[PDB]
């Protein structure tokens, strides 16, 4: 599949992912990727975004999730169901997601990644996700609600 579980003690710690030309994975998740063709490509870390980036093999190249910085408020999909984008925040119904959900992509309706999750807080009947977005100019920026935790 087009996102890979990094593994620790057998028990997937974080799904890392392949976005737009670079595998990305969160720094806090510590694990072997579970795809040999990535499991050794040196990672260039950047703690300001809590992520690690690396070029995918030139053969792997044409599988790589598209992205785009234009994300109007509305419904976006996600492995564990729908996420909703309102008031410049991504929110998920309560209780779905946690330790293990770090770094999975959030895709739009045309299938392109708009965000990669790094954490959460359950807030009442919903959950705000701390995420890495491509801001209105396409610059990456880490958007985090207060008190959010590393998933």
């Amino acid at each position: 599949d087009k996102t890979f579980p990094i593994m620790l003690n057998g028990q997937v710690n974080g799904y890392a992912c392949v976005v737009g030309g670079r595998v990305f994975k969160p720094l806090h998740v510590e694990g072997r990727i579970d795809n040999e063709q990535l499991a050794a490509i040196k990672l260039k870390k950047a703690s300001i975004y809590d992520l690690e980036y690396g070029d995918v093999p030139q053969c792997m190249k044409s599988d790589t999730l598209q992205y785009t910085s234009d994300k109007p408020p509305g419904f976006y999909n996600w492995h564990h169901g729908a996420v909703q984008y309102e008031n410049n925040r991504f929110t998920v119904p309560r209780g779905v997601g946690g330790k293990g959900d770090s770094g999975r992509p959030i895709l739009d309706n045309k299938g392109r990644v708009v965000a990669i999750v790094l954490g959460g807080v359950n807030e009442g009947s919903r959950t705000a996700l701390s995420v890495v977005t491509w801001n209105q100019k396409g610059v990456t920026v880490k958007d985090t609600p207060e008190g959010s935790e590393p998933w």
Binding site: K137, V139, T140
Partner: protein, 52 residues
């Protein structure tokens, strides 16, 4: 005096040039990580990049 002058200049120079490198990669890392943001010309000139 000369050994402390060589020491204080070198230490200051290398700490400064490491700060300059750290800010350059902290400027650049977002644009690097977002493959298409239409390249600036004051950021992109100042810090080094092959433009679009």
């Amino acid at each position: 005096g000369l050994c402390t002058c060589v020491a204080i200049i070198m230490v200051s120079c290398v700490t400064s040039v490491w700060l300059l490198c750290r800010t350059r990669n902290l400027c650049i890392t977002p644009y690097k990580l977002a493959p298409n943001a239409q390249v600036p010309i004051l950021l992109a000139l100042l810090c080094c990049i092959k433009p679009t």
